[PDB]
């Protein structure tokens, strides 16, 4: 009758050298949040690997443990191992990654069209980490389209949110929730993130921009304090109005204001997302044209 199923091993740090394990190229695959993100190999099987590697500190270690709370969701890259080793007389944190090569989640988009219900059912796996990560009280901070990778190109490749370099731990049956903890704002943002990546999925491009032709708000620091977006045509032409007020929802300035994640998961789109048009978008193009 025990949630058994509920308990998950802790992360057992490992001191020995990772270059006994693995084969670690001088290759990078890009720069994360902390630390640079090299291309390492298994010495025992030949699998390839992402390895980020952080500098020793007290944020390091932070995004370690925070990360390997998260990697219990499956849309969230895996941590294979966690090595605190000594580069060049410095001590740092070695993450071990599963590796990623589907490509950023537009340039799968990009290259072929993308269906709404299509969107939808990227814009729930995404929603998926996104929850898993604020019931256990993490915030992301840093969700944008470049941090979600698909495993392989395959067309059931699954999606994963990415760097946990700017994650942050959040802290009577009638009891009200701003009772049994404060927890300030920075949920919140995380959903407004949702509302950016939706925004592009629908249409190819982003609602805020550079523009100094206008008159208000020409600065996008401005348009997006303001909160000055919209759905311009063609683009949104046969977009409902039911999806446009979702996306109104998420992206409104007033953090407090903004929808939660379980709002969003219950929101009949994200529900059914097979009963969702499944009308044609221009992003597949748009985003082509750049």
């Given at each position: 009758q025990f949630p058994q199923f509920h308990v998950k091993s802790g992360l057992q740090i490992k001191k020995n050298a990772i270059i006994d394990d693995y084969k670690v190229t001088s290759q990078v695959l890009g720069l994360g949040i902390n630390g640079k993100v090299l291309q390492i190999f298994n010495k025992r099987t030949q699998e390839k690997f992402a390895l980020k590697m952080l500098q020793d500190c007290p944020k390091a270690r932070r995004e370690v443990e925070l990360h390997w709370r998260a990697s219990?969701?499956?849309?969230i890259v895996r941590i294979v191992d966690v090595y605190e080793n000594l580069y060049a007389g410095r001590k740092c944190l070695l993450i071990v990654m599963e590796c990623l090569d589907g490509g950023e989640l537009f340039s799968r988009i990009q290259d072929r069209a993308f269906t709404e219900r299509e969107a939808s059912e990227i814009m729930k796996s995404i929603g998926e980490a996104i929850q898993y990560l604020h019931s256990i009280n993490?915030?992301?901070?840093?969700?944008?389209?470049?941090n979600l990778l698909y495993t392989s190109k395959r067309p059931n490749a699954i999606l994963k949110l990415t760097d946990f370099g700017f994650a942050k731990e959040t802290t009577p049956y009638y009891v009200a929730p701003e009772v049994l903890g404060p927890e300030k704002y920075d949920k919140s943002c995380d959903m407004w993130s949702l509302g950016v990546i939706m925004y592009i999925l629908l249409?190819?491009?982003?609602?805020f921009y550079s523009n100094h032709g206008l008159a208000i708000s020409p600065g996008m620091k401005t348009r997006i304090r303001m909160g000055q977006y919209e759905f311009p045509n063609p683009e949104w032409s046969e977009v409902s109005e039911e999806v446009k007020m979702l996306i109104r929802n998420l992206l409104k300035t007033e953090p407090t204001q903004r929808m939660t994640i379980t709002e969003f998961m219950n929101h009949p789109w994200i529900m059914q997302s097979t009963k969702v048009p499944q009308t044609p978008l221009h992003t597949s193009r748009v985003l082509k044209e750049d």
């Open positions: 219990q969701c499956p849309h993490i915030a992301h901070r840093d969700v944008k389209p470049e249409c190819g491009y982003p609602p």
